[PDB]
Amino acid sequence: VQAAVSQLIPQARSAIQTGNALQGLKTLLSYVPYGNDVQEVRTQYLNAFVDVLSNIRAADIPAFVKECSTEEIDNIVNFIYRGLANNSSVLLNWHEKVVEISGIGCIVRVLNSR
Template sequence: MDVNFRKIDIDQYDEDVLQEEELYEADPRDPAQVLNDAKAKVGAVRNALSKGDTVGAINLVLDGTPVGPNVEEAKNLNLQTLTSILNSTKASEIPAIVRSLSQDAQDTLMKYLYKGMALPGWGEVSGSVLLGWHEKLTEVAGTGCIVRAMTDRRTV
């Protein structure tokens, strides 16, 4: 039985097929610049956390998140920075922090929570931390936040 027909990419012959680049605008910055910006955020986040400004640190990470192709290293660095903030935050502070975020920042945070949950073994963060943040974020932002995070093509 010949199964080679299953390995043919038929979309290459279709002129009307949507490419990922056509679905959203990629980051206009050079991938090296995006990585440098992500590295600069790490220092600024540490500085904010040392001052006890958790909201400011989260806003720094969620503002200008890298999206699009060719910026995977910057995306991973941003995720690591955010997970360090999530791990160091007390559970009693989470609702106030989530309320202080804008709707776009809440949606981006939800994307990062799902990305953290998709990691094998959940990476450096424990499941209870991610699920705790998810619960509080859903209570404040509603289920619309989940829908927007799941349907947005701009992955973090």
Template sequence: MSVDFRKVDVDALDPDKVVSPEELVPPLPPVDPQEIEQRGQLIRQQLSKGDYIGALQVALDNPPYGGDERTKETNLRNVLEVLTTIKSSDITQIVDQLTPEDQNVLIKYLYKGMGSPLGQSHGNGGILLSWFEKTVDITGQGAIIRYIADRRTV
């Protein structure tokens, strides 16, 4: 055995200390797709009444971190429906009323929307960029860092 400490593989000496990527992600509760569909109906009801902040809070509340891709896409559709309905002059006021947790979830959905064909269709790209700009103006760069560091995806 070499005495040069730089060449000693510590993980080989104590295999119990190895952390797998699955252990880094917190356990996620399962998500019922019907719950997301019901949430979409509630969001549409609130939008029809003009309760934009309530609709956005419902859309951002309890994101389906543990759901399958179809469920996550359905919730993304719900969030995008709210974001595209709200006038750009009201964005700052609405983002300011959100809790810091909801603001972080909003940043996640903005990134996901900008990266998906669903978010780029029908001129939604410009709307998402406007939301992103005004959200970062309020939250600062911390929301972007939290998005990058969080392993849970929406």
């Protein structure tokens, strides 16, 4: 299968239960499932990513994204846009910050990623 991304999700899920949710994002925001046929693996990933964002306090967002790497930003925006489809409007509020503080280029790069 090569879906060891299924071992990356439990960490983030627990990182919600504990309290420090952002820690889980910094976790799953490494080594994401590249485009495939098997979306069922990616869906369970996306499901976690948006669940993580849902319980990160608004005040903590500008501090994370400012510390984040450009790979991480391009990646986080990339999932925000895939997240907007059916998941809350909290995503839309993330989109607002990770654009205003990390530039428009992030979206431009999301526009490429195959």
